[PDB]
């Protein structure tokens, strides 16, 4: 349901609100009409993807832009500079959103957006496929739902029945797959098979893709809230951000690949570990040392990598190294700073900002 998808050229034939397409799909589903429900569910999935990509493209033009330098006098009033910059950014966002086709339809509710994020529609999808003689797509959709929720009761029974079916042992695939996931899988396979240059190329392709996806996911969390109290300026600007910050904190874990039913722990440090070993086996320590320093930055309690650092340090003059080749790579430092700042701010705000008007039921 993603073959005929292109952001640049989305068919004007199927531009409808997401809520209406979902409503029609569920109406046909309850009406025991399977073909039409399959079509409408596929339409709604494509529309959700289009909305997400439009939001990502809009948030890239505005925020990541060169800064205008104002006059000398405005440098003596910091608050006016900060909030004038915020004003300019908000204007750029609003101006950029009017021109994109996905934003000129009716926007969905928060319940429907969370519902789509929780991968709920896929449930219906798989059943429908079974009723239309689409067993491979049925098992694929069941696997895609099960991947996000591993403790559901009915889905496990469905997957057991599907696996009992003959032939259907090799169509298992994730429909909501990403680029860096497949690149990582390919590079891991190359590494396990005693080949280094291919693994290096694939991992060096995979890292920036992960970083780009991460920053787009962070930028997509700064959404709206529902109004339920009426507080002052600083006390209400700082309550919107606390919800935004919860969503941002819970964001590095969602993008982690899952292999064998278990998420890969310490994803970025694992990438650097692989990269360092591969570069060593080519005797290119000029690139092997910074990866090791980056890994030690992310995980500081590994004796293996510290021993490797000692080994590299003592052979500095043999391989002609400089101190400039002993610092972490800058992208890793940026990632480390962002994640650590977010955790510190949330821990701070969970003691001074959030009210204590609730408790645990006994």
């Amino acid at each position: 349901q993603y073959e005929r998808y292109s952001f640049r050229s989305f068919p004007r034939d199927e531009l409808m609100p997401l809520e209406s397409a979902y409503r029609h799909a569920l109406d046909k589903y309850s009406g025991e009409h399977w073909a039409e429900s399959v079509g409408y569910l596929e339409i709604s999935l494509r529309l959700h993807r289009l909305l997400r990509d439009s939001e990502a493209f809009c948030h890239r033009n505005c925020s990541a832009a060169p800064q205008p330098e104002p006059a000398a006098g405005l440098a003596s009033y910091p608050e006016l500079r900060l909030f004038g910059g915020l004003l300019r950014r908000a204007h750029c966002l609003k101006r950029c959103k009017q021109g994109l086709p996905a934003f000129r339809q009716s926007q969905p509710s928060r319940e429907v957006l969370a519902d789509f994020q929780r991968r709920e529609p896929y449930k219906f999808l798989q059943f429908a496929y079974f009723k239309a003689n689409n067993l491979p797509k049925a098992i694929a959709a069941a696997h895609t739902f099960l991947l996000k929720h591993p403790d559901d009761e009915m889905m496990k029974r469905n997957m057991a029945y599907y696996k009992s079916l003959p032939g259907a042992e090799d169509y298992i695939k994730d429909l909501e797959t990403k680029s860096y996931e497949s690149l990582f899988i390919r590079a891991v396979r190359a590494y396990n098979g005693e080949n280094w240059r291919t693994s290096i190329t694939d991992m060096e392709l995979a890292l920036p893709d992960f970083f780009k996806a991460f920053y787009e996911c962070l930028a997509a969390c700064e959404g709206s809230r529902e109004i339920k109290d009426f507080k002052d300026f600083y006390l209400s600007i700082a309550d919107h951000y606390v919800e935004v910050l919860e969503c941002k904190i819970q964001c590095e874990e969602n993008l982690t690949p899952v292999i064998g039913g278990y998420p890969v722990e310490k994803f970025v440090a694992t990438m650097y570990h692989y990269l360092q070993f591969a570069y060593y086996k080519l005797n290119d320590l000029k690139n092997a040392a910074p990866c090791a320093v980056s890994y030690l930055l992310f995980d500081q309690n590994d004796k293996v990598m510290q021993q490797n650092l000692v080994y590299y340090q003592y052979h500095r003059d043999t391989w002609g190294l400089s101190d400039e080749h002993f610092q972490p790579r800058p992208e890793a430092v940026q990632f480390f700073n962002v994640t650590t700042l977010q955790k510190e701010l949330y821990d701070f705000a969970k003691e001074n900002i959030m009210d204590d008007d609730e408790g645990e039921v006994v």
């Binding site: 409503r23 569920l26 109406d27 589903y29 309850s30 449930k123 219906f124 798989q126 059943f127 079974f130 009915m154 029974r157 469905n158 029945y161 599907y162």
Partner: peptide
């Protein structure tokens, strides 16, 4: 025998 499908809300 038969996979379980969700009840239709709408």
């Amino acid at each position: 025998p038969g996979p379980i499908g969700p009840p239709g809300p709408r």
